[PDB]
Amino acid sequence: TLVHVASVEKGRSYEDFQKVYNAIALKLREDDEYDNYIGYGPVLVRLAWHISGTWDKHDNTGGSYGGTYRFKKEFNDPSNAGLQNGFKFLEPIHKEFPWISSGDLFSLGGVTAVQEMQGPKIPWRCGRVDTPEDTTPDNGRLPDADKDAGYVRTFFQRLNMNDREVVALMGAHALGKTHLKNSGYEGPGGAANNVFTNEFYLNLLNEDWKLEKNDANNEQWDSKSGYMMLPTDYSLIQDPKYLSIVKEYANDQDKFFKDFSKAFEKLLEDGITFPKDAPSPFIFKTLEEQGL
Ligand code: HEM
Ligand SMILES: CNCc1ccccc1
Numbered sequence: 001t002l003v004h005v006a007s008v009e010k011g012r013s014y015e016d017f018q019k020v021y022n023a024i025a026l027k028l029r030e031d032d033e034y035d036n037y038i039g040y041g042p043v044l045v046r047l048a049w050h051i052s053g054t055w056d057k058h059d060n061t062g063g064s065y066g067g068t069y070r071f072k073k074e075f076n077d078p079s080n081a082g083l084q085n086g087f088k089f090l091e092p093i094h095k096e097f098p099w100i101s102s103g104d105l106f107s108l109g110g111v112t113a114v115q116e117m118q119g120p121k122i123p124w125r126c127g128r129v130d131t132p133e134d135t136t137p138d139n140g141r142l143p144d145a146d147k148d149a150g151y152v153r154t155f156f157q158r159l160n161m162n163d164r165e166v167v168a169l170m171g172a173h174a175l176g177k178t179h180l181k182n183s184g185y186e187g188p189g190g191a192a193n194n195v196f197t198n199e200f201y202l203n204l205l206n207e208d209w210k211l212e213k214n215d216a217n218n219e220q221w222d223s224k225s226g227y228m229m230l231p232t233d234y235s236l237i238q239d240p241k242y243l244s245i246v247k248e249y250a251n252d253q254d255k256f257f258k259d260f261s262k263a264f265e266k267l268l269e270d271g272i273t274f275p276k277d278a279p280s281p282f283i284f285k286t287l288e289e290q291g292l
Contacts, residue, residue: 002060005273006127009099014282017108017126020097021284022292024112027089029287035176038194040089041113042176047086048110048268049172050079051103054137055270057160062141063271066131067102073133079142082182103128107268114264115286117175119196120257123265123281125274145185145230146218149239152232159270161263167245168259169267173233174200184216187228201250203227204237 009016024044032039051069054062068074075084090109094100100108104126111122143155156166176193178185190199207223214220221229236242249256265281 002271003273004060004063004065004129004131004271005275006065006125006278007129008127008279009101009104012099012126013279016097017100017124017282018284020093020100020105020108021112022287022290023093023096024090024109025116025287026292027093028113028116031089034085034089038176040086041117041194043083043086044089044109044113045172045175047083047090048107048113049169050083050142051106052267052270053143053159054141056137056141056158057270058158060271061135062137064103064107064268065128065272066135067104067106067128068131068133068136069106070102070130071133071136073136073139077139077142079139082179101128101130103130110264110268111284114196115284117194117196120261121283122261123283125269125272125278125281127274127278128272143232145183145232147232147235149235149242152235153239159267161267163241164245164259165263165266167236167242167249168256168263170233170236171198171200171249171256171260172264173230174198174203178220178228178230180214180216184214184218185220185228185230186214186216187220187222187226189229189233190227191225198249198253198256200233201246201256204229204233204246205250209234 028040034040052064056062090105094105108124111124114122152166173189174197177188180186190203192199207225207227209221209223209229211219212222221234236246
């Protein structure tokens with residue numbers, strides 16, 4: 001097992017990171033046209049997850065710590081097609097705040113996006129440190145979407161996530177959409193795809209899903225409302241253990257928010273050793289809470 005010890009960017013404290021948060025949040029508000037007016041929130045959430053989801057608990061390779069998405073091997077992972085948009089969004093932020101590590105920036109982008117989209121508070125810790133190009137994980141550690149519940153369950157064991165954590169994390173698929181050219185899947189999951197809600201679960205349960213083929217010749221579940229579910233999304237109502245948890249989150253928005261927050265923080269922190277005298281996690285104020 002590799003050890004990656006969090007090291008606070010020199011002399012920085014909460015206020016410095018709140019300024020970075022605010023710059024991301026202001027740019028989210030400004031650059032509103034992206035992806036037919038969805039805006040950049042969803043893609044920044046996906047970026048934070050994909051830079052974290054390379055982690056392997058068995059040897060501590062991958063994970064958010066090293067900021068390795070900046071290197072070509074990872075940037076060009078077919079699993080990451082489309083995330084270049086999130087990276088380009090963050091470039092002016094990094095230029096303004098060149099002191100933040102890449103992993104801190106990519107993970108903070110996700111936190112900022114969730115919160116600005118009216119999601120739960122996500123505590124966040126600084127101290128990821130850029131690591132060299134040879135530490136970039138090989139392609140193929142992110143999950144396939146054409147598979148079943150057993151695949152999902154097994155996949156997420158590598159990330160140390162249990163059934164509840166998996167079902168909670170998947171609720172992020174209320175955000176944004178699938179794009180045929182990126183992933184071979186097309187369409188949104190619901191009507192509210194740049195506001196963070198529990199609509200993924202409601203739509204799973206309440207829509208009439210039909211197994212269809214899309215224009216890339218892949219199967220996906222479609223509804224007459226114009227929404228879709230990936231096979232891995234739909235697996236959460238095929239498996240009886242997942243189904244129970246889907247029903248719980250469909251019926252309790254606060255529970256969903258609390259469980260998502262904990263699972264997302266955990267995802268973003270996997271692989272990182274925090275010294276006992278490290279700062280406590282930061283909880284950033286939204287622009288709205290600041291009157292900004
Ligand atoms: C079994 C696990 C998962 C699979 C197979 C999967 C698959 C996908 C696919 C195929 C897309 C569409 C990409 C595109 O065409 O642009 C997507 C989008 C997205 N995923 Fe996942 N995903 C998984 C888990 C997660 C998790 C755990 C999160 C975060 C907590 C997440 C967040 C997102 C977001 C926010 C988008 C929308 C991106 C956009 O609109 O640009 N996904 N996912
Ligand atoms: C909710 N199912 C469609 C979808 C999957 C991934 C991201 C957004 C939407």
